[PDB]
Amino acid sequence: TLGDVAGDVSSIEGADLVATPIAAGGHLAKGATDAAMIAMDCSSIPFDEIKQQLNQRFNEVDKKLQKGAEALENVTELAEKTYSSVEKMRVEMREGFNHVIATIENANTKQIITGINQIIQYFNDERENINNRQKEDYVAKLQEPASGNFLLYLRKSRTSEDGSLHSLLFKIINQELANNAIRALFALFYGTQTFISIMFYLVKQYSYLADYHYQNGNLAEFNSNFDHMKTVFQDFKFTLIGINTSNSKPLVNTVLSIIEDVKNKRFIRNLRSNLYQKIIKSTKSLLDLREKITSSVLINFREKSSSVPRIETPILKWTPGTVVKYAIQYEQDGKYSKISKWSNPITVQRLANPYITIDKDRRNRLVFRQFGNEKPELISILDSSQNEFRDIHRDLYNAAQMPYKETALGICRKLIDSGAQVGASFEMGRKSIHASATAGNDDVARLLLAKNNGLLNVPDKNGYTPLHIASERKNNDFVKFLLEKGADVNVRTFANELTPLHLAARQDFTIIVKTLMEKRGIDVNAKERAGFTPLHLSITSNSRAARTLINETPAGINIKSNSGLTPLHLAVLQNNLSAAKVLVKSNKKVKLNEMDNNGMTPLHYASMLGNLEFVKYFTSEQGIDVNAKTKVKNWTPLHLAILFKKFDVAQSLLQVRNIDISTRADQAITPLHLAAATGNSQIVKTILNSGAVVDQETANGFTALHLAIMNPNTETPQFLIAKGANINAKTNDGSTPLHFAAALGKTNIFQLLMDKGANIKAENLINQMPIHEAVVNGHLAIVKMLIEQDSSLMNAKNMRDEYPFYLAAEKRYKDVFNYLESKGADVNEKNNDGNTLLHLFSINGEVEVVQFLIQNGADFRLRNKERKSFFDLAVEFGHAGIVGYAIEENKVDLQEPYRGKTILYHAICDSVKYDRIEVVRYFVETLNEDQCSPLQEAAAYAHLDLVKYFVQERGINPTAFNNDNQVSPLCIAIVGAPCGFVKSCDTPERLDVVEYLVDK
């Protein structure tokens, strides 16, 4: 919500301090209140993230060039639009791409996938790394040598070139037509999204640096950077719209074709694919826009010079002995084209009389002229013709800008006598009069008053009137002597409309605001773009400005601003005590409880910022409106003080005046819970000494006891014990704090709970025995005491088919496991209800806990209740790796006859029963086939995946031998004589392999 930031920085008053109230509104607009949030182990994260976003907003706003530097700001805004849209896509894609790490190592060559992941994260980190520097540091580090176009060099052609992985990856999705395919498809999808992000960001940053160094830096490398981003944009245009036959197909269109083939598959998958379908629209929009972009003008022009001998003037602003190098640029319909050349840079010892022999054109020409250094660099903005008049106009403008008024009057007289026509625009704006206003020169304007229409109301690029410009120049008497002409007094500027009264407030000019107020009866409480009065914009000046403006004239002392900010609010924020004092001493109709847009009063800001003197002054002086509920969910300043870990202010606010403790803040939150969350013994003891409730359960069913337990502090537990708190408590789930106490891992607090009658027998709606938590979190001592207390109740059953030793197992903590096994716990063969525990983990795809318990001495050769082998179970769900580690452990290589079955008879049956491709690939990794032809076994049930895989990993035809029409699986599948697997041939797999065999 950086738009709110812009609206609230329209008043330059307190940018960061007036950015804090949007964090306060986020506190007010987001449904934060719940026990996890109250623990504040979270709150710091969202608030720090909001502060970091605000820091990004500020350290990008301060880099921005104001207006009218080079017309390619249209290109820049096109950038920000399309770019930022790419991040609306990319932020949502990020949470999904976090999931792909779960299924790592399913392809042999996933190192390229992790390489692209680390590359994209590397530049995502660098974006914020560079994005927090200073202006000069920003430009220097974007000009940093030995890296330069580091991103361009990295993204040009690398060993991890996406074209190589592109074909094989589309083969992986072709497998998905029949998973790792989803994982790597989304890897490349995020890849192309971040590639378009790279392109937009790169062209944006080239544009920004071109503008930055084009503001009087140098036009030469400005044109160089112009060519640079033109080349980059057309390079991407070629890479994704290629008009070369001997070139790779565009990535975006091939991805699209994959999307149609996937939807043609008509199969189910994870919701990640659904997010992909949601992002399809964004991808196609980005495509269409990228081909519709092609921006700036594409051409340059040529011109010449000519010395006009009409008049001769001795001039010093036109410095003698300097070069007359000039150049022109194109500017039409809000676009620009840069050029840089002066074939005849001359150093004539004459006036500004040399005109330009510019060839006529249909495009408006901006003509600059150069001494050989950094100049205004804006002299003519013409359409058809001009004969050296622009140079005279530039001399007039810069002379007006000169502060030497005593000589400015003489030089302006001598130039206007020569015919220095006025009204021309400079720096793409009507300036000259405003340049004089900046310099504060008097006689120059008083003799230009011949053009009464101009000086009266001439606007600027942003509509800055000469009154607006002179209002921030300390030039009081000159404003006096130029005001008699009767200029408009409610006139404003174009963008971020402001009156000169509005703008004078920040610059602390009491004399100037006086000068304004004792002339006519001018409006004083006039608003502006964000709905602010000049009173609001004065307090940061922290001097006599506002103190004067309060009482010297009637004004908008209490006016509801559009942002909801009043002088009281600002005086609170920017920590201006004297302004608050003088505002209180006015004793006019200054309402104190005037709500803002958010819904919380200046006292609330004072508490949140944690300013002691403001709080006590507010509690003492006014004696009115010192504690009340807020607009939506009824906060108090004390609540804010507790939340933001400000203590001294908290007990000060308690001791200044009676503040009700029975308050009903959101979810009936009394500040006892908040104080417990902070964990300050003196604060909580003082609150209880104030007659506070001891065991008030909140609307979520939480009391301060649980939350205090989750706090690291250990004293307020005993404090709550002493102050009569129900030890046997019921949370939102009806849970008991023993669960949380064990979860955190405080042995001594747990012992105290046990001493005061806590009951281990307690549970929740899903009957969580505290042993479950005590083992999943993991610690020795809690287990020791609970055993010594009540024999673990033989580790009773949970909701799922779980025996607490199971959780202790997949936790894999050495000491507790050894303790449980030594003193008697669940063991592998006690799983008689179904198969054994080893036979049970492999069903749920266990990888490491099985191996670690085997090396923990657990037996291996047990036979399950279902006669079906542990190796076979490992094979059945893609876990033959455990069989391999059994081989290296030398458990047994199952080639010995089990009911006549050997290693080959164990590779056949399960790979027919289940489609574990990786297990077959591991079997062939342990290189052997034993003349097996699993293609024909698959075709016995006509499974196309396995027959295609055998074809691709062997190359032999699916029918190598011949017989009396019975050896071929095609005839077996089609004729289906003895009703064996015939009545269920309706499955398309029965005709799938038919074609892959007919084709050969």
Residue numbers in the entry: 48 to 225, 233 to 348, 361 to 1066
Excerpt from the paper describing this PDB structure:
LaTXs bind to specific receptors on the surface of neuronal cells, inducing the release of neurotransmitters either by directly stimulating exocytosis or by forming Ca2+-conductive tetrameric pores in the membrane.
The cryoEM sample showed a homogeneous set of characteristic G-shaped flat particles, corresponding to soluble monomers of the 130 kDa mature α-LCT complex (prepore state; before membrane insertion). The G-shaped particle is composed of a C-like curved region, corresponding to the long C-terminal domain of ankyrin-like repeats (ARs), that is engulfing a central compact head region. The N-terminal head is orientated perpendicular and in close vicinity to the tail of the AR region in the best-resolved class (compact conformation), but shows a continuous movement and is tilted away the tail of the AR-domain in less well-resolved classes, resulting in less compact conformations. The resulting atomic model reveals that the N-terminal head region is composed of three domains: a four-helix domain at the N-terminal end, termed here as connector domain (residues 48–115); a central helical bundle domain (residues 116–352), and a short β-sheet domain, linking the helical bundle domain with the AR domain, termed here as plug domain (residues 353–452). The conserved helix H8 contains many hydrophobic residues and is predicted to act as transmembrane region of the tetrameric LaTX pore. The surrounding helices shield the hydrophobic surface of H8 within the cylindrical bundle and protect it from the aqueous environment. The long and curved C-shaped C-terminal AR domain consists of 22 ankyrin-like repeats, accounting for two thirds of the sequence of α-LCT.
